[PDB]
Design a protein around this nucleic acid. Sequence first.
RNA 1: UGCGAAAGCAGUUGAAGACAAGUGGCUUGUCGUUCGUUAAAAUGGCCUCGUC
Lengths: 487, 141, 777, 548
Amino acid sequence: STARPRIITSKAPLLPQQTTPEQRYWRQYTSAQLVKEHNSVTHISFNPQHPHDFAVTSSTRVQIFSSRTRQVIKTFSRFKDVVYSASFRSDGKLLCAGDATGLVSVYDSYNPRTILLSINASTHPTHVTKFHTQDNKILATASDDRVTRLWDISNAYEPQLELTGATDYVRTLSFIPAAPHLVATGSYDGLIRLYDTRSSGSTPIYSLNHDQPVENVIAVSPTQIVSCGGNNFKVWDLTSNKKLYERGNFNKAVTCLDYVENFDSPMQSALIASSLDGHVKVFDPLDNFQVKFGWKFSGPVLSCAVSPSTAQGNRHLVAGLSSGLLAIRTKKKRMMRGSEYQGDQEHIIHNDKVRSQRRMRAFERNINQFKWSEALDNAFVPGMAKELTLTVLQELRKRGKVRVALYGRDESTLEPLLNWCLKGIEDVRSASIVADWVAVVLELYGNTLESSPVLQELMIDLKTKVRHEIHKSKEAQRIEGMLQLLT
Amino acid sequence: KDLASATNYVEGNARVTSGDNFKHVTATTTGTVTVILSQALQSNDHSLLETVLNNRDERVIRDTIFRLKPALAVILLERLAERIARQTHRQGPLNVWVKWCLIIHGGYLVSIPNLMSTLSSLHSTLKRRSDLLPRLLALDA
Amino acid sequence: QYKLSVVSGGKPALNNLSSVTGNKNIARLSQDQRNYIIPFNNQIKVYSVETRQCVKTLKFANNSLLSGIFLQEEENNESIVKILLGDITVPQQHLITVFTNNGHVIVLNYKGKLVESPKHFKISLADEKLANVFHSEGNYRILTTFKHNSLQSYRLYALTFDDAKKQFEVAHQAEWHNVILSNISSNGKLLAHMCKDVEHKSISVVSLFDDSVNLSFPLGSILSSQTQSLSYNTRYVSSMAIDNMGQQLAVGFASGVISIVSLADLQIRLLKWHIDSVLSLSFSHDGSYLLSGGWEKVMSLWQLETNSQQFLPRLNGIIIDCQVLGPQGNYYSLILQMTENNSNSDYQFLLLNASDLTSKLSINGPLPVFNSTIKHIQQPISAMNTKNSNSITSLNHSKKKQSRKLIKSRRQDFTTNVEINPINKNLYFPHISAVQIFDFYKNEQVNYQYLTSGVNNSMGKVRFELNLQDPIITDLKFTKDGQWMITYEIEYPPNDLLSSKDLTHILKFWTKNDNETNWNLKTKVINPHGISVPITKILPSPRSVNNSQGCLTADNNGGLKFWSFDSHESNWCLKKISLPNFNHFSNSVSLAWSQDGSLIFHGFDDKLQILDFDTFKKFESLENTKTVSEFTLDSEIQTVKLINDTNLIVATRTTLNAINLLRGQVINSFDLYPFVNGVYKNGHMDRLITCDERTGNIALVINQQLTDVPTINYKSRIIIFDSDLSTKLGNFTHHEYISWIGWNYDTDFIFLDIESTLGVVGTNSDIFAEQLHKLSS
Amino acid sequence: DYVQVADGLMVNKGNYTLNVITKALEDTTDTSNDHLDNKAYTGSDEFLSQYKIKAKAKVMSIKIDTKNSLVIAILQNGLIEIFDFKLTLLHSFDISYDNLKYAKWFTENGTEYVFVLCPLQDDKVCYKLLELTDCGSGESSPIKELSSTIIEGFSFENSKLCYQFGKLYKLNQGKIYIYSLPHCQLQQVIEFPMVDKLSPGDDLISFQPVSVNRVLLTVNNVIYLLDLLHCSTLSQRELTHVVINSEKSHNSKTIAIGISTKNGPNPTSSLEIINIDVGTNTLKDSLGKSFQVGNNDSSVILKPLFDDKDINDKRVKCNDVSGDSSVPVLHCNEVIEKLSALQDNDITSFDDIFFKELKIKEEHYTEKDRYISDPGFLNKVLDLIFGKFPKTLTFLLTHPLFPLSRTRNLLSLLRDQPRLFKQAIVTCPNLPLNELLEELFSIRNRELLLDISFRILQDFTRDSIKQEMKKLSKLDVQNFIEFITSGSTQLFQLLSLVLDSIGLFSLEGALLENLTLYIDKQVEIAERNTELWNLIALPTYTMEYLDI
RNA sequence: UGCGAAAGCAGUUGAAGACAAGUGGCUUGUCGUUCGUUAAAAUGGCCUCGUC
């Protein structure tokens, strides 16, 4: 003996925009929940050590959401002006928020009733603050006093390091993720700088010039960093000290970046960017930073962030727009005692239990039970789909006989064949099967066409559909001709 | 499985491919809208792409394609090819679009040294559309 | 110092008569039901049922007392006809006795190593006869065929051996004149034959040992009036069987009914399920279970006390003979035929225990795909004439037509396609929509896999649907690192429908690891090189371009395409393309590829083109010193070959040329016209003749003899050369027709017969322990 | 093996500078460099030595010393450095390494020992040599390669006591003993016209093959297994063959026997001392396409033999292949003698030409498969039939059907005899694309132009056709499409191709609209006759009548 | 049936015998009949091992 061959479903052949696995994995992000906020959602950060929380930065009101239920769980509203930068320490325990009054405050997580300490920065709005990645207790704050500073939170009274050397509107910081003594900054004249923290820290050891005023500087490796300003993002490498990639597939200036490594995906590394245009686009740092997928939202997206590498639950993409709301696109990952014994100590184990197959279709068991006319009739029920109907038509063509499947019909049951065939003749992959099926039905039912008046209008508008389709295919043949000219 | 049985054929995850498709080797013009198509072809925004593609006036299409920069018309009719591969019910009202780019700009993409490698999707779609003529003539007969 | 050596086995070679026997199965079980003794055309296999290995072989080319009997050149009509287990010389105390079709009774040394001298006797009264044996406790009978309308006669003799220790002696009980169908009771105490004695054709049942049952009647009594006036295929008795006792006969008619009749009062019983003709049927050991099987591949066993069935749905082949063979009926024999190739009569033996109907030891012959019939290889009987079977009225007609065509016409190539797997050195056979992996060391088959979207095993083929044609496999190549089957096949839409005027060409890639013994599909190139367009020639690459992972296919047009697998894309796709539209279209394309990785020898018909790889176009001339990139020979070339970078070996439609590439002129030439004129199809000589790495190449001389008028027998010669036609260092003649030869990558060659054998072109404690082992048994 | 000829310690150095290479004393005193001659002043050197030495970078210049201290000289700033004694005789083969790595402590009489270059770091002297005939530098191990015409052969390395291929090999008086690119072989020159790549594993060469270029000055090509070999009595250098990523045009090879040159690479713009001119800048040598293109030292007379099988035993094993017995047409010397008999004084008559074809292997006057075909015989009989007799039918209908013509199709534009022109255009299997396109653009406008249309798109390649018809006249295609307008599949396909190849904007309007009218009636009749091709109850009361 | 290209090319088609039916002969049909030419129709459709 043998088994039974499963009735295949011949899907769509090589149409363009083919389904690549990276766009499959990003395509399965569903349920785009849209949450209103009060003002422009400037900054969004995530929780490092338990990637289950993310912090959003509205005007005067910093919220933190959880990834399990995607509702607001805590607020932070002891801010005397608009609040700008929200960041987490790497042990996930304390939230640093830089506001516009300059008194940059650090709370701890889930306890807004206790401000841990208030760093007095300059009179200028402290526009970005973030903790160090390697060390915990050093905190980088850049205000628009054309300067940035490193504070030790233990010795919170004084600036531990005073990083000057930037001209106009210092705006982003990132630390080189292997050597902790290398701190990279960005300003609004371009000229992405970086400094050694052991040095005096008053001039960059080497600067890198994005010609546009740089908008975000992140690190994806110890070797290469990614800086963006204007309508293109440029990858620089520190070892070659040189720009080596630039993609400009946007309209307006790209406004935020981030990176994710080693997470559960066919695409290993992924750098996604928000672009102030309505699009957030993912780029693949493996093969020369090509674009891979892009989500469109209903206004200029001002920041975006994805869930980190080890999220362990519902993985998130989030993007705060400047219009006043926020987009979350998520993906989600005593008598019967012996009857679980499962054979531990026993000598010889025998196993031939057949797995239950998935449930066969109605037309599949009809063709397998050889009732061919019933297979055709249960095939042309409007509860079925296009590829299923095409495959049962292909099956009856290839194996049985369409003459046999039509040998006992009448005026009535010959209608839904032609009624499907009207929609089926127009598209590409069906029209040959439509052609020979309506050809053999008009071969076999000519005298009933003479008697019965009902399907005559079906034959008439099938003639019109054939004329419409021969006109369309003739002009497409003309386009094939003129491409043969242009080659 | 029994030890005297021909193993059943399996489709699995086979990409069915057609061999015809391959991989690689005062102003006084008109006031109508094509720089929307230019910066809707910079990015990929299907909403305003369908807003600029659901017109049908031929002279308007002429002046828009004429004002269009030629360097991105190749990916213009690439994405028109994927639109007409997705559905062929309104084939003509942008078959006019996929021909007028050729008519207005031909020599630039002729002088482009790799035509069929990056236009291999569109003429594959059109030969898929046009290779079934004889039996539909038989249908009509 | 070369030699030819027969290595591997062929078809099982049953009693392939034209309905002269209803017991078309001569395999046997030993009386200790653990060993299956099965004859071949080339071997005598003995298998063990609990392990399913060849527990011993009796080859024919290894001893000189039956290789002189049946291994000669022309008169090899000596064939084994029955394997008795009860020995004849001194009875009752573990050897087998072969009865042959002329009567050379041999007794052969079953358990353990055989001796060079087995017991022989050519039987006494044989002019040209032996049908089968019948045996009992001592009393043995023989059935013999005899001399009109060409219906043989049966004479029944009684046999014994003793008192004169060389010669048997016979007794001549009784005879009958015309037989068209006869079957034996499964225990052997009864037979029943037909007579055709007008007032119509008649049935008779005769007991052979005693005379307890003997009767005869016209079969118009068995026929109803529903068949008294209608078509002939319900008057056509197709098969018959008897119970063990002698009171329940069964006929199976060609429409498909099975009339059971009694034998006491000649009253009938209608077992009616077979839609097509009934080929195999047999009672069980008591008379309660009619076990049958017909054209569709089901095994149907009918309990008669309710007329209800148990069904085995698919046996990958139609059934010819099946009966119970256990001590009480715990094993079902089956002789299935696999009719989806109309070329050869390639049976497949299997028996299977009745417990859960699981199979046991499917012994099958090797399965080539010849392009023509071979020698009286007609299809079995169905109700309708078709392209996979032939009906009742077209059997002697098609037999005369096939014999006369093979006598008269001049198209006697019928060479098959193969491959050798480079990893595990076993050879793949294309079948119809199927590959069959045969390893010639143990001369067996490891598995069998369908490759297409075929209805070969979904349904069973039937009366009208046998005109449907399964999608045949044209050609598969291996990426010679043993990592990818590149398999190209064609599929056929059925006729009387407007899509019958084309045929769809599908190419597809198949991968495996060495764990799995069956391949899994990777990518399905439907319609390559255009649409409704053939490919016929196809090449993998040697290790240059992608470490033997570049598949480049030719065209029927003359075009070329080059596909190769990449890393960023984990799917096989293409790189290069060239379509010249030669408005003449010859199928005799060919391809060679330079193993350095430089150029492609495109052997289009009388246009041998050189193609450089970097532009996938014709070879460009820069130095202008003998920069010829196109040869034009005398006739249309068919085979191009390259042993190393110096020399090209191109056989055309008439002759053969041997060229230096480094200096583009003819080095040698051998005309071939007195052997090949148009006897080969245009494109099959490349499958015939082949390469090596260093030991030269092989041509294959074809010869069909001329009786003192041509005949159907055969001899064929190979001639081995060395390094662009220096010497004919080896000439060899085999006594049966060769089909192909090919370098199996262990540095020799393997050819194949049509009497399908394979061959290689080769270079007091001890006494107490013994008494205890004797007495404990 | 060989390839085409052209041009009608520098292997461990850097060129394009003033101290580019180590120029020898080619009709000079001691030493120089190449500047196309920097500070390379020797010391106590050149007793009779016209050669030189260096340490590969002009950081420590060396000499062909008569005191054997080739360690330091005027090297970088023109002042000497610390010099150590290495050899004791004429030290041309004493170009050491940089600093205490190796030093070929050699002489002009077979002396060898262990030495160094910067310091006096030495080892055990285990030379054991005789009056040799080869003393070079080898890098299998760091070794002095010593071979002889009397008794010596090895690469002797005094750094691990390594005799590579140790034998008493017997060489001869030669001059082109090159190395190889593989490093496991030195291309030995066993005579003037006899050289072979002697592999220094066990003193064995591949094969001593004869060549057209006798080995007079040979060096190793830096790409692959190849020797650039030139002859002293000639001006060309044959690049014979048997590291290839970068092309072998560097200063590694030193073989120059061209137009008065001496021991230089392909960039020979500084030859000896006076910076003489250069030749052909050589490319690399990787593929087998060049080997299939050209190779020297060809063969014996290699005319086709058409040998059958032997006279074996096949008496009762008859086959009856084609239509008759096994005796086919087999005559070559008789065919050549019949060609001479036809070219003799009976040439002018046609009866003695028909009987000449009868005395030759006579077919049924029109067919192939009578395999008597050689190209030289073919072209000589084509000359003797197409001098001035085309007046006979038997030989000229036997011979349109032979493809071994060797581009004698220039007469197809010249002669036009009608049935002979038809057999020419449908039969002769080497046709020129330009000649066929000009015959097409000639305006006879009939079925013979239809037949050459079928011939051109049965033979040629579409892109070559469009390239060859791009460079032609628009008046011919205008009259062509005028003929298409006035009055077929192959004509339609070349119509497609000429409408492709006429251009994009260089067209008229009027004849294009005449073609528009012709093609609209053509598509109308086309769809109408494809339509032709694919065109190939009980009433309750009635009134009847019966009979009587 | 032969060639060939997946399209098309050239050409078969009889002689005898047996048996049956229908009207002693005579008309019609089948061939487990011979020679020669390369030349639809019996109500009959494919198993269990998801089970508590």
